[model samples]
Target chain A: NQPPRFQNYFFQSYLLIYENTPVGSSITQLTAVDPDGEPLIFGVVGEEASRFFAVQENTGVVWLRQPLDRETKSEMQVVFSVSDSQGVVKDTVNIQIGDVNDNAPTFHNQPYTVNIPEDTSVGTSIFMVNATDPDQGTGGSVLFSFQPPSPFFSIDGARGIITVSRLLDYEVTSAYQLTVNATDQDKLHPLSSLANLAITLSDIQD
Target chain B: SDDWQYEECKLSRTGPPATIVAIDEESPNGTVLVENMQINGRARTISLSLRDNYGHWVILDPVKQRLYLNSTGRVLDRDPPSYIHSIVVQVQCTNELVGTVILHEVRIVVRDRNDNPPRFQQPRYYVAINELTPVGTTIFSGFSGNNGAVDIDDGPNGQIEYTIQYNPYDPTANRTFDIPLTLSGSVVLRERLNYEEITRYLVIIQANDRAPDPKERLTATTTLTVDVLDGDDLGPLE
Candidate 1:
């Protein structure tokens, strides 16, 4: 008789669970059966793993103990076992922490207020906008752009460096506001944050 | 991989959360900044307030749009108790054309003052060691992960250096049981040990930061007790 063999683990053997799921909570249930139809019990093994999850002895219900943080840890792997009055079997599965765009990109430098001479040349280098995101993967990658961009100034989308596009006239406008935005490239679920920059037209004549 | 993976920013101490404080004096000259901000579009009055419990220590002159420190010689760290880390203002605006209430979240980060002193996670240490074992042996660990110091402060102010003291200090400290400042947490013997000759040792370890300016610099001390044990000959050979 072809006897008990390791059952093939399925997709993402590999699964996902959000953080902070209270005890006795479960999503999808794992299962197994015997051709002979004997009474069965399901359980998970390991101390560190068990501290977070539990399997019901009679119900085969997978439960949680603590809320997991994807930022602290993205995923976990644990062993689940199913046993009958006759025999026992074991398999491992990975549990990935599904991301929820829990973090936003933060500008490291801000209030980028600076003074430029009224006679400054066009296409002059201004300043770089540096930002940092605390998330991992695309959720934390930052892209920069101007909000209602000013006609006289432009920001390099990739570099976050602001530059002058037209000649300056301190007489016409003494100063202007430049609103900058930092965003993670998640179209379906993008997270965005903002910072401000102000450029003053100084009355410096050479 | 279609899996979104362009780049990432894992939080590696950006040097002890910046201690940023914004103060505005007189905005009579827009050029002379107390705090650099532009209040426009569906806006009425712009006010500044500190986030957390630092409110009593700081203030804002809404009429003058000026920020002031209520008390002098005050330091606001990202750490709690003082909680003077950031200033979040309630910038609400009502559109004239349409009546809608909108709240704008403006975050201001604080900069470090290097005013705090380095503190130790372990206030006191009790260690036991085998005597006359070997030269260059490590006795104890440090205050960090991977046997290192639990950094209590940040940059220049919290960068710790180790020193062992208490004279009649005839221990081969230069060659034995010296605390490592940069490399690791373990205190290693610069020389060999002898249990019968020296049964015990009581040393003070001083940890200091490198913040500039001649003042009573921020520092901390931990006690080290090196106890020698009798090793049975059956113990492993050198």
Candidate 2:
């Protein structure tokens, strides 16, 4: 009797599964037949395989046992083994975790502040904000805006550069506060974060 | 109607009929040119108008009895540089109750704010002089045939004084060249120059405005290269 062999029609080199997939959900079914005409027993063997996935011993079906995060651990190799009366057969399944919009946009610095002269020309780029998102594609791209809006200050949505929109006068108003917001480009699951900016107008010889 | 006799408004200027008011250049819009203008008269309503010649530069509000710089004409540059240093506006006050009218002339002088600094016609000047030239000889008169240093202001702000400063290393060289305190703006030799001692002089000439306010004094500098051509000064010392 020959060793059990995996069926080519139902097996693949790699499998893509989206992150945050609930446990106890079927990922795929593995099929193998023993040449001796004996029923085969299916089992997943490896250090990382048993922690994240479980195989049905009777039906050879693979399912999730633990949650997966694409950012921390993207892909792993799982070895599926089948045994019969004669011998055992092995195959590798590449599990690639697809990215999802699970992480929110994060600001690097908090309570941003700057001091500029009152005579600073209008339309000058005075400050800039930085943010990051770990998710892939549109979810990772961060855009900036001003909360509550400001007549004297404006920001570039894509570049996060803050510019002066109006002429500054120290006599009229000495200090100003602005709330800056950063949002990811994910349409369905958009996430945002906020930071504060304090601008002090320095006196100048007008 | 016959019982109410409308009295004719006889007006006279309470202040000087011809007033000279000085205002700084680049004053902001809506700046009050004159305040509390007194046109003594007995009338229900008195309307004031600035003549068309200088009306575009100022506005007279009869109700407030004040004059304001036209919001559009705030850039009152004094020298064409705004050469027009002053504006004469004739203020006419008419009593609407009666046909009586009074006219007064005001000369608004645009004061010289040291907004302009002394500027040289060229950034650098080049001149050749003979080493045997006698003392008190004019080496260079002006910059590129133009005025030495021009300040586009009026009065003390426009008046410029020239001075020549030598390097600190050459303590004795300061006595070689001198600029007199006059409008001629000529560089005069204080001592005889010798080609063997110094072939060229990289002198720095600075011009400063005579602004009364120390804070308004502005200065500009230019480089002057004086090449000393060898003369017959190498003869035996007899």
Candidate 3:
């Protein structure tokens, strides 16, 4: 007699809950289905250990033990294991953690203020911008971009340092309005946020 | 003594008066003497005296034409008497008597004495001090031991007096108070003064004897250097 040969198995659907997760918040759920799904048994394994999250032993449901901390672990990557009653492990689905408006764009410091003299050189660096996301891996990494109608300022893409790229005349323009766009790097499920920055130039000559 | 016999000679009234005496043949060959002599007219007298072998004076007078033998009670010539070894009874007298003689010699020697007072090698001495120093910073005090050849007298004269003079280098240009000499001959800086603002100081020190007199007032001077130690000077922002 010939041994039973299995037919081709196919992935049916993949769904992620809460497209963006707030930093330092509860871990959201992600579910997936296989064409041969029948009360699948599930477990997690991969580079991003999900000790805080677990999947039901019988139902294939995933949930968080505690909120995710973006500063600690920005992005996470894990493989979800699904099994059948016959103890035959077949489907492995990759789950991505998405970024949410979990964080208001923050200055690395509180009040995030700088006192720069009005007479400061045009190209002098006044301050820096630092923000983060809760999603693990590339999902948590943020790339800062400027918005339309650019302000009289510039930001370092890598270092987030903002410099006075042009002359700032306090008598003519005492204050400047700027927008910073923070986008997650993960292509799995893109997420981003915007923050408004106000810069006040004081008269130092007097 | 026999009555002194006077011998007299008469002038010949010729060109110059001259006299000559001849010895009697009975007299010994070296025996000569002079007796009371007188000259009449313009004639000059020559008297010759001689001592006989027995040291007795034998006088022969040419002007008085007299000869006397007085063994005692006679005053001889006032001038030093001349002695003759041989006997010449002839007497030739002249009128010249002055001559030259030598007396003494000259010698020289020199000695040195302590005269010039010791002076400071430099005119002025400078010292820097922090305002925070104690009353005395122990700046320079004493003079250097005499630098020239060592004299046993140098050490005693080399003692000096340490004093503080007016400070022209000061920002205020004021004279500082004098620092009293301690047993160790040192002066300490004042206390609680800020050195940063006034970093440098000029000190004037006079080196003299403990009690110098007008003549012994020798002096020397040296500048003292004081460095301010840096403290925590962090700005307010830091």
Candidate 4:
């Protein structure tokens, strides 16, 4: 009696599933045959494997038993085998989780404050703000901008650095509130967050 | 004889007059001016007191006999309204047993650092010189009568040397201007002006301090535009 064998395992498409796929959704179908004409059972092996996936005993159907989060764990492996009364055959498949735009850009340092002298020359670099998104690729790339555009301040979009655009005078306006905005560059859907930066000017002995 | 060492109270000297100490401006707070000072002899009953401090920048500990900087007073600056190059601090030493008191004065000289960069009084200068002007004619002077860059730092940090950095209008031509007295910042004509060849000259003047240390040197620049007026010295165009 011969063991069960996979018909076209290597030629099959790669196993790929999007993150957050609903539980009980079909991931893929497996196929095999027994040359001795014996009844075969399809099963997924391992104790931890059963928590995430399940296989039909009669047919070769693989389905999700638990929801997957790409951010937490992006990829995983599972072993599926077919067994007859006489012999058994096994195959391993790797599954990749596709990324989705599910995260918003977040600022690391909030409520920023800095003290600058009134005599600070124009075009001087004052401060830099940083933010990040955990999503992959374009979903994680963050760009910076400002709200109510400041006449005396400018920002570098790529670098997230703020610079003095005009001369500062303590007698005129000693304090400033800069509302900084950070946005992700996801193609389909983008998310944004806001943070505040405070600048205080000190008098110079001119 | 060895046990009688503590019987008499004395001092190494009555005073260290004109005790001079130097600290750079913008020195960190708590920097020690006098460390482990002991004017009085090893007698246990003798002590010291800070009597007078003219600058208010120095503080002393009577028991510890140590002097350090004070952060609360006016900022220590070497330039005017304070013009605080040097200040006086008096310390009084007293022996309680004998009731003897001695006053010692110290002069703290604020040494200059290369902190202040020379700055031009004006952003730009416009001068109209005639084409017939002689080669040695003075186009600009930074003396009291004229404007120039000034550095607030004292000594080599304050002294400035001027240079005609570049002539962008006539880059290929011979240098037409020079600073004869490098310290004066006076621009003189090195080449006679010609209205036909070029009608305008744009010069950049750079003023750099004479700080002995090359690493800490600082500089400032100003733009000068010389308009060549059409004087009769130009021959009629053929």
Candidate 5:
């Protein structure tokens, strides 16, 4: 009889949080019963097995041997083995990480100025405010808000679309400067970034 | 030898009086089966010729005559992942017979326990047959080694029976019992082929051994997909 025969043929897969998980934290407990009910020792099979996790010998308590970063790898395939004194079996598990809020909102190559024909109708989409957050889940849930909360233009709270709020006229003001803030939901400590938006009225014959 | 018997021991690297099958050597002839060995000749100078180059000798304790197995030998006993049941070797022992050569021959047969499970040469097999092919139609049973799955072990672990594991995952898969075959790894269709009902049939075949005791018997599984080739089962949309 081989000592490595696993009690179960396949390993159960799961999604776990590991973005900020610390070492020595308990992850999961593996289960395998020796056929003869004799004592079985649990351990990692090789360097590939011990790279990220450790297991208890008697009870098969698996724990995080090292911290994991979701940005580096969102999902990890963990390979390990278990064995009775007489036989052994190899097994593998998939650790899908639920990302934690770790990145601040940043706008990449955002345009600061926009041109309007003055006759452009109200509620017409003028431009798009592109912003991205690296964090997943709620941390990546970003909301776009104006600094002074302007009434001339409106930005969607969830969506980053910007459109003309009221009719535009080049005579009253040729250009207007606006500030937009991209904020992410991190209650204890929120992260935000500011980008400039400008609207210039273009000449159009009445 | 008349005293030849099966010696069962736990697989290990070293320890104990390493004579796996302790024959009094007084037994009619000489035959020792093992992965490897080392000779420690203290009082006599005997020429040793190992016919089997596969075997290895780790060490030799002159006092205890304990020739232990190496790591490779231990793995061969534990799992070759194939059907190589035993290791065979012919040892020629030439002793100093008054400054003359007196050759003696000993054949050793070292048997592997349960290292290999029956496996198919291919994971999935493909075959095309007309929808009108009669029942009891056999495919690929013409050759010897062409049998569905190959098994290596020569013990109870080698004796295998075949069965289908096709589940009701689909309405077509439920038509499993309609397929029949002999115990010799041959598949014969028991139901009439119908391309309209199902253009393809997926057969999940399982080959399992009843060995390793009431304990867990090793089993191997594979799939065969038969495509119902267009045989004009239905006339062109006339």
Candidate 6:
């Protein structure tokens, strides 16, 4: 075949490659692409220093020294140059790191049950409904609250202890059905899990 | 009738004409007789009219206006022994005179009966005293019964009064006492005693209806006993 006429080619596919991949997690990724369907190579330029992020020579994987926090900076900007195997450099494409759910809160029990005395004085501690997010480390963790339409109890976001704020009268209300939810503190797609709880009250005399 | 011979005029006379008298007489014609007239008796008077005497009709003062006996009747002076005098005249050859009369008078009266009983003004009376009452203490109020209704006259029959009949016996003179009747019919203790002397008392009360009439009087009596009780004597314990 005669040498293909030197026709100008357009960048066809652009992908932001991530170092660590997981649904709903924030990560650093490569922000470049090539138009000729040829193997692509990327190089940081101008104010786009390598300190911000790094990409492998041939793998197109990008990594950061510090993990990215989506809550602070949604999209990171970096000037980069793209080249084909022919050495012909053409256009640049911006890559965005899509959010994914990497870590979810784990409950002590998928469904917690608690028994409270009917005559339990107001402000009595019932039971703790705790949740932990392995991804959030020890600092950024989960918060809790009753799901829609479920009441008669409340959960503490920090301590995780559910407290009884009102009188539990067995004669009037023998039991309460509650749905407890735990959500991550930060993230576009924070893990949100629900747990159903049955709270029963026993007669004080009994 | 040709030679009219006048017989002696026979007339009877008695005490003063004003004095009441009883008279008995027979008529010359043998027609009828009237007798037994007396003073102060129920039937004490009689009268005669000369116009109907002797079966011969005689008229005096023919017009009748001047005749003394216009309507003849008898009269008796209700007071005792009465007398009468009779006067006769030829009557100017006439046989009869018009009338004679009599009159009388007297009195009447009514009597009484007794009915009614005695009543008490207050059936029961109350009085208060310390529990440890002494003998002779006036625990009972003196009250008298009333002679309720009486028909006897107000003098003696309607009078009301009271008296004490039975006196209670007292060992230390404390138990013995009398209930005196008050003018108002209430009884009161005549004496007082100490608790140490006597702790109880029994008294008798009598009431009488002293209507002014002694025969109409009535009496009633009742007994009252007094009891002594112990009052609060202990202190509070913790």
Residue A168 of model 5, lDDT score: 74
Alpha-carbon RMSD to native, per candidate: 23.9, 38.5, 66.5, 40.7, 33.1, 71.8
User: How many pairs in model 1 have backbone atoms within 3 A of each other, for residues 3 or more apart or on separate chains, i.e. clashes?
Assistant: 20
Task: Decide which is better by DockQ, 1 or 6.
Answer: 1
Task: Please provide TM-scores, in order, for all candidate models, with all chains considered together.
Answer: 0.42, 0.46, 0.26, 0.48, 0.41, 0.26
lDDT of 3 by residue, B1-238 (tens): 1211111122222211111122222233334333333322122322223222244444544445455443354432211232121121222222111110111000000111123344555454444544444554554443333431122112223234445556556523223334554112355554444455545555555454422244645554555444454344355421
Restricted to chain B, the TM-score per model reads 0.59, 0.78, 0.35, 0.83, 0.55, 0.34
Tell me the DockQ of each model, to 2 decimals. 0.02, 0.00, 0.00, 0.00, 0.00, 0.00
Candidate 2 per-residue lDDT, tens place, B107-214, comes to: 565554678898997778888998888899888887414557887765456666677776665554457887664334678899878888888877788888766567
lDDT of 1 by residue, B50-77 (tens): 3442345435454443444454444434
- Candidate 6 achieves a global lDDT of 0.41
lDDT of 5 by residue, A53-166 (tens): 788988788788778876687545455566565334455444556555678888877777788898988889887787787664235546688998887889866567888888
DockQ-superior candidate, 1 or 5 = 1
| Model 1 fnat value | 0.00
Candidate 4 residue pairs in backbone clash: none
- For model 2, the local distance difference test gives 0.71
lDDT of 5 at B66: 36
Candidate 3 chain B, run of 10 with poorest lDDT? B100-109
Off by over 4 Å in 6: A1-100, A136-140, A149-151, B1-238
DockQ of 1: 0.02
